[PDB]
């Protein structure tokens, strides 16, 4: 009745197209339990929204600041607030925001009220889609926009993973890595730099230093699952 991830297949029973972005993909049956699916549905949106901002953020950083590698931006950035001053502010602000989001998930409607100003409240809403002040402008139908959000979100989640593994394998940002592919497309793919055959395994070298010195301490910087690289 609806397009599927694998055309011609039959979606699992627990998937019926109610959710946006429901293309009948759950081969392991992780979402069969209703309670689990509610938590996983919330988690997918959060991962997707974080990934979309991060992928957009990384791309703009490279264009605006091509001289700084996004993978190194943690140590290269110097601000007066210092390391622990920034972390302390981030911890408390994120703890408040995340606990309130969490409470809505457990008990929907219980954190729609503004704690300080008694006249402001979020109108009733679905979990994961807090309207009101968070949605001043809605260009069109929500149902269509929800599909657009999750599809772009699932693409940005894969894009970030592509940035991480490309950075560790090439040591270059997403745009610089792309230009390397375009210069020599036949000699720049992962197949062109790695291969395993019976009796020999060749893997690229991790282009990230094993450790980073930062303000008098050493921060380990290991490549992700390097021993399992092709």
């Amino acid at each position: 009745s609806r397009p599927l991830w694998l055309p011609g297949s039959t979606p699992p029973a627990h998937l019926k197209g109610d959710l946006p972005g429901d293309f009948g993909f759950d081969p392991l049956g992780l979402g069969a339990n209703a309670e689990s699916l509610k938590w996983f549905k919330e988690s997918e949106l959060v991962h997707s929204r974080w990934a979309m901002a991060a992928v957009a953020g990384i791309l703009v950083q490279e264009i605006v600041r091509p001289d700084v590698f996004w993978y190194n931006a943690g140590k290269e950035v110097e601000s007066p607030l210092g390391p622990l001053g920034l972390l302390a502010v981030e911890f408390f602000l994120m703890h408040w925001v995340e606990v309130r989001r969490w409470q809505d998930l457990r008990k929907p409607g219980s954190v729609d009220q503004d704690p300080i100003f008694s006249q402001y409240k979020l109108p009733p809403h679905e979990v994961g889609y807090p309207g009101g002040v968070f949605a001043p402008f809605i260009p069109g139908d929500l149902a269509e926009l929800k599909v657009k959000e999750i599809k772009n979100g699932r693409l940005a989640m894969l894009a970030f993973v592509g940035f991480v593994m490309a950075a560790q394998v090439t040591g270059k940002g997403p745009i610089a890595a792309l230009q390397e592919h375009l210069a020599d497309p036949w000699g720049t793919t992962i197949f062109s730099k790695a291969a395993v055959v019976p009796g020999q395994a060749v893997a690229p070298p991790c282009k990230i230093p094993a450790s980073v010195s930062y303000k008098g301490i050493e921060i380990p910087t290991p490549c992700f699952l390097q021993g399992l690289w092709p």
Partner: protein, 227 residues
């Protein structure tokens, strides 16, 4: 009433001549399971059709370029001028991506017959797909299928089975003698008695491994021939 593989034998109860090229031959009874027979018929078509391309490729290539040994044509240094010394990793990337798509499309047709007949981008384009393994339509532009299809299927499978045996003859002949199918034929004709299998079967001319742009690929003959 059809002729069988041997005289006086009885065809299996599940081989009734419905399929093309049915001689009632199944000594191991692998086709007794009806679900397995459908899958094995598809793999027979794939082997038959790929083998026929293989024989035509080896024969045509040997005539056009006699100096190139088909057994070693896969080495990058032996590639034609435009592709000489091409990155074999990049070359494999194209083949993996493109073959994965068409094979999964063909595979989903076996799983759910008639479910992937339509173009996924340009809606409205479809293939008749009268029988599993016989897409038709864009795959039969000249319209030969609009005729005695059963006879053509018999001709396809008969030539396909012959090509399967022919190609493995090329492989074993290459391993034993180190010559292409036409070169091997010429050697036999010149000295029929001094050059035949009775003397060559004991020799395997394939190295133990080859280096392909820094990657060592193990090689093997099909029998423990004397290296």
């Amino acid at each position: 009433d059809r002729k069988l593989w041997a005289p006086g034998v009885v065809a299996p109860e599940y081989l009734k001549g419905d399929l093309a090229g049915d001689y009632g031959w199944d000594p191991l009874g692998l086709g007794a399971d009806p679900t397995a027979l459908k899958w094995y018929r598809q793999s027979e078509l794939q082997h038959a059709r790929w083998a026929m391309l293989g024989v035509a490729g080896v024969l045509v290539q040997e005539i056009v370029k006699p100096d190139v040994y088909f057994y070693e044509a896969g080495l990058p240094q032996n590639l034609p001028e435009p592709f000489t010394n091409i990155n074999m990793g990049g070359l494999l990337a194209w083949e993996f991506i493109l073959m994965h798509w068409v094979e999964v499309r063909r595979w989903q047709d076996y799983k759910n017959f008639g479910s992937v007949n339509e173009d996924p981008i340009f809606k409205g384009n479809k293939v008749p797909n009268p029988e599993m393994g016989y897409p038709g339509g864009i795959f039969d532009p000249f319209g030969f299928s609009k005729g005695n299809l059963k006879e053509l299927q018999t001709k396809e499978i008969k030539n396909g089975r012959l090509a399967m045996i022919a190609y493995m003859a090329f492989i074993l002949q290459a391993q034993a003698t180190g010559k292409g199918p036409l070169a091997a034929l010429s050697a036999h004709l010149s000295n029929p008695f001094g050059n035949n299998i009775l003397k060559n079967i004991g020799t395997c001319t394939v190295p133990h491994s080859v280096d392909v742009q820094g990657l060592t690929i193990p090689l093997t003959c099909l029998w423990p021939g004397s290296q």
